[PDB]
Design an enzyme around this catalytic site. Structure first.
Site, PDB file in Angstrom:
ATOM      1  N   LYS A  54     133.815 103.615  21.686  1.00  0.00           N
ATOM      2  CA  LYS A  54     134.243 102.457  20.905  1.00  0.00           C
ATOM      3  C   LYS A  54     135.694 102.071  21.182  1.00  0.00           C
ATOM      4  O   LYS A  54     136.064 100.903  21.013  1.00  0.00           O
ATOM      5  CB  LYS A  54     134.040 102.722  19.414  1.00  0.00           C
ATOM      6  CG  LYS A  54     134.141 101.452  18.584  1.00  0.00           C
ATOM      7  CD  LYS A  54     133.299 101.552  17.327  1.00  0.00           C
ATOM      8  CE  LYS A  54     133.089 100.181  16.696  1.00  0.00           C
ATOM      9  NZ  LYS A  54     134.365  99.424  16.511  1.00  0.00           N
ATOM     10  N   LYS A  66     124.112 103.684  19.934  1.00  0.00           N
ATOM     11  CA  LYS A  66     123.091 103.928  20.976  1.00  0.00           C
ATOM     12  C   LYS A  66     123.524 105.061  21.911  1.00  0.00           C
ATOM     13  O   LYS A  66     122.672 105.856  22.295  1.00  0.00           O
ATOM     14  CB  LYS A  66     122.849 102.619  21.723  1.00  0.00           C
ATOM     15  CG  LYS A  66     122.189 101.536  20.881  1.00  0.00           C
ATOM     16  CD  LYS A  66     122.518 100.118  21.294  1.00  0.00           C
ATOM     17  CE  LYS A  66     121.450  99.135  20.866  1.00  0.00           C
ATOM     18  NZ  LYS A  66     122.027  97.960  20.175  1.00  0.00           N
ATOM     19  N   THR A  95     110.464  87.360  35.759  1.00  0.00           N
ATOM     20  CA  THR A  95     111.723  86.652  36.024  1.00  0.00           C
ATOM     21  C   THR A  95     112.402  87.101  37.317  1.00  0.00           C
ATOM     22  O   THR A  95     113.355  86.452  37.758  1.00  0.00           O
ATOM     23  CB  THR A  95     112.719  86.806  34.864  1.00  0.00           C
ATOM     24  OG1 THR A  95     113.260  88.145  34.841  1.00  0.00           O
ATOM     25  CG2 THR A  95     112.041  86.491  33.548  1.00  0.00           C
ATOM     26  N   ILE A 100     111.613  81.432  38.385  1.00  0.00           N
ATOM     27  CA  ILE A 100     110.945  81.770  37.143  1.00  0.00           C
ATOM     28  C   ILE A 100     112.018  82.346  36.240  1.00  0.00           C
ATOM     29  O   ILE A 100     112.517  83.451  36.488  1.00  0.00           O
ATOM     30  CB  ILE A 100     109.794  82.761  37.362  1.00  0.00           C
ATOM     31  CG1 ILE A 100     108.641  82.103  38.156  1.00  0.00           C
ATOM     32  CG2 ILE A 100     109.314  83.327  36.049  1.00  0.00           C
ATOM     33  CD1 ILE A 100     107.422  83.004  38.333  1.00  0.00           C
ATOM     34  N   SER A 174     132.149  87.582  47.727  1.00  0.00           N
ATOM     35  CA  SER A 174     132.734  88.935  47.875  1.00  0.00           C
ATOM     36  C   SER A 174     132.933  89.215  49.361  1.00  0.00           C
ATOM     37  O   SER A 174     133.800  90.020  49.687  1.00  0.00           O
ATOM     38  CB  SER A 174     131.844  89.955  47.221  1.00  0.00           C
ATOM     39  OG  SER A 174     130.575  89.997  47.848  1.00  0.00           O
ATOM     40  N   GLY A 183     124.762  89.612  48.453  1.00  0.00           N
ATOM     41  CA  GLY A 183     123.446  89.280  47.960  1.00  0.00           C
ATOM     42  C   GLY A 183     123.030  87.880  48.356  1.00  0.00           C
ATOM     43  O   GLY A 183     121.853  87.534  48.255  1.00  0.00           O
ATOM     44  N   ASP A 186     127.519  81.917  50.284  1.00  0.00           N
ATOM     45  CA  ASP A 186     128.082  80.781  49.567  1.00  0.00           C
ATOM     46  C   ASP A 186     129.096  80.113  50.481  1.00  0.00           C
ATOM     47  O   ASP A 186     130.159  80.685  50.768  1.00  0.00           O
ATOM     48  CB  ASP A 186     128.710  81.217  48.244  1.00  0.00           C
ATOM     49  CG  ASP A 186     129.164  80.039  47.410  1.00  0.00           C
ATOM     50  OD1 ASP A 186     128.706  78.901  47.686  1.00  0.00           O
ATOM     51  OD2 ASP A 186     129.951  80.250  46.463  1.00  0.00           O
TER      52      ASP A 186
HETATM   53 NA    NA Z   1     113.999  84.362  38.260  1.00  0.00          NA
HETATM   54 NA    NA Z   2     135.802  98.688  21.381  1.00  0.00          NA
END
Ligand code: NA
Ligand code: NA
Length: 327
Positions: A54, A66, A95, A100, A174, A183, A186
């Site tokens: 935290k 969690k 997705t 999609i 990058s 990936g 561009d």
């Molecule tokens: Na997609």
């Molecule tokens: Na924090």
DNA sequence: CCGACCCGCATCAGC
DNA sequence: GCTGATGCGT
DNA sequence: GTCGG
């Protein structure tokens, strides 16, 4: 730091994030999780409690709870349930096809379309983008090594110059900061005849030339200033064929080009700091322009930019190499 | 507490 | 047919 | 979900 330090935590947070994006359709929830998973990926210590987490920016009370459940038990009940949920996992899996999003994924699964196989059986229900995303599902998830990117940058710079030697093209991303892999590609592009106050074929000529030499193989979308599509390096005539790759090309007015190059070079952390610093100096920087701020806060007319350095000089910085813009 | 959290193009919804 | 909303990717 | 006015 080695992924074994907090990789169980960061894989949990990234999974949680994908479900917010693809199933809940909560993009802000997705980005908080990705943020927290990022700051924890860079924390150089094996977290021993949610309370230690935290302290870090972007980790709040829910993520601290969690981590505590995950540390004590080795899993997260709510994640384990989402993983076995046949509707959820099918939506999340769909997705991954480019074109999609969450909305189409929900509708497909709502009618029994759940797998690539079902999609391959129902091409009548896919728009043009999704047919292309389906066609190249596996290729699009592969990364592109820099040696291939250099080869691809070779072909793009050569054919652009072959159309008009006054074109200016910059492979940003990058890859311009030196990344060992990418990936997608561009490309940012400009011409001296195109300005803020200035033909609608400058982009089309370059796209067409790349199609005639069979580098660009497909088109997801194309208008007067943005082209998104697919390309592929030529086969070795005897070796395996390279996988098809994603490539975007934007045409930018020449008076905003170096602002655009700076921005689409990044990183996203570097851009924030430079914007943050530029404000404490009396300038506002976005992806298009750099403008001065009056004493009340009213922006003035954009200032002349003719290089990346011009922008650095304005805000009293020393030019940072793309290599050193990691943050 | 409660709002912020960053546009070009294909396609659909409404007129 | 045209205008604006939405989905999507970035 | 996290932050902050
Ligand atoms: Na997609
Ligand atoms: Na924090």
């Amino acid at each position: 730091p080695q992924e074994t330090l907090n990789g169980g935590i960061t894989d949990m947070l990234t999974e949680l994030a994908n479900f917010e994006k693809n199933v809940s359709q909560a993009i802000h929830k997705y980005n908080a999780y990705r943020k927290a998973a990022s700051v924890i990926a860079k924390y150089p210590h094996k977290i021993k409690s949610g309370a230690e987490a935290k302290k870090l920016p972007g980790v709040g009370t829910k993520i601290a709870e969690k981590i505590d459940e995950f540390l004590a038990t080795g899993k997260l009940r709510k994640l384990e349930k989402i993983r076995q949920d046949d509707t959820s996992s099918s939506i999340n899996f769909l997705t991954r096809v480019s074109g999609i999003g969450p909305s189409a994924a929900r509708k497909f699964v709502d009618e029994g379309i759940k797998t690539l196989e079902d999609l391959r059986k129902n091409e009548d229900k896919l728009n043009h983008h999704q047919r292309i995303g389906l066609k190249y599902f596996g290729d699009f998830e592969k990364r592109i090594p820099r040696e291939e990117m250099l080869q691809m940058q070779d072909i793009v710079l050569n054919e652009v110059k072959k159309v008009d030697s006054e074109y200016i093209a910059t492979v940003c991303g990058s890859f311009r900061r030196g990344a060992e892999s990418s990936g997608d590609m561009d490309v940012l592009l400009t011409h001296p005849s195109f300005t803020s106050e200035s033909q609608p074929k400058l982009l089309h000529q370059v796209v067409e030339q790349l199609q005639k030499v069979h580098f660009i193989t497909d088109t997801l979308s194309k208008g007067e200033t943005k082209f998104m599509g697919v390309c592929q390096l030529p086969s070795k005539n005897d070796e395996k064929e390279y996988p098809h790759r994603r490539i975007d090309i934007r045409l930018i007015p020449k008076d905003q080009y170096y602002c655009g190059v700076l921005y689409f070079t990044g990183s996203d952390i570097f851009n924030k700091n430079m914007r943050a610093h530029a404000l404490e100096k009396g300038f506002t920087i976005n992806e298009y322009t750099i403008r001065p701020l009056g004493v009340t806060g009213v922006a003035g007319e954009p200032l002349p930019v003719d290089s990346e350095k011009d922008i650095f000089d304005y805000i009293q910085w020393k030019y940072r190499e793309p290599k050193d813009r990691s943050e």
